[PDB]
Design a protein around this ligand. Structure first.
Ligand SMILES: [Ca+2]
Length: 120
């Protein structure tokens, strides 16, 4: 029943709360703080789902998205952001993001997102 979730979030505080929720739902995860840190991990381990922040000190989530859609065509990706914008949400969906999330969102919503979108 478990999913293995890659979590990409530069905010310490939100990263830990999201990890706490994932565990609550019986889910394996790896948490990194940058898209640049996510790429080595994506080549080491298979994941059922990627959840990435959009605004990060480095490569941004839209660039990580297009990069995951290239190398891992099977991998669902959720984008989350504090600064939502309609045009960029449209572009992420057009590129095959599973969802485009404006922060914040309750822990039970994140577990429903994983169930709706993770492989398995
Ligand atoms: Ca950020």
């Amino acid at each position: 029943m478990a999913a293995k979730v890659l979590l990409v979030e530069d905010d310490r505080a939100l990263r830990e709360a999201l990890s706490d929720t994932l565990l609550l739902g019986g889910h394996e995860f790896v948490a990194v703080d940058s898209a640049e840190a996510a790429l080595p991990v994506l080549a080491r381990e298979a994941f059922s789902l990627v959840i990435s922040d959009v605004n990060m000190p480095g490569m941004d989530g839209h660039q990580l998205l297009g990069l995951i859609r290239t190398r891992y065509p099977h991998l669902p990706v959720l984008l989350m952001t504090a600064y939502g914008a309609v045009d960029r949400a449209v572009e992420a969906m057009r590129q095959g993001a599973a969802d485009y999330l404006v922060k914040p969102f309750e822990a039970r919503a994140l577990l429903d997102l994983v169930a709706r979108h993770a492989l398995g």
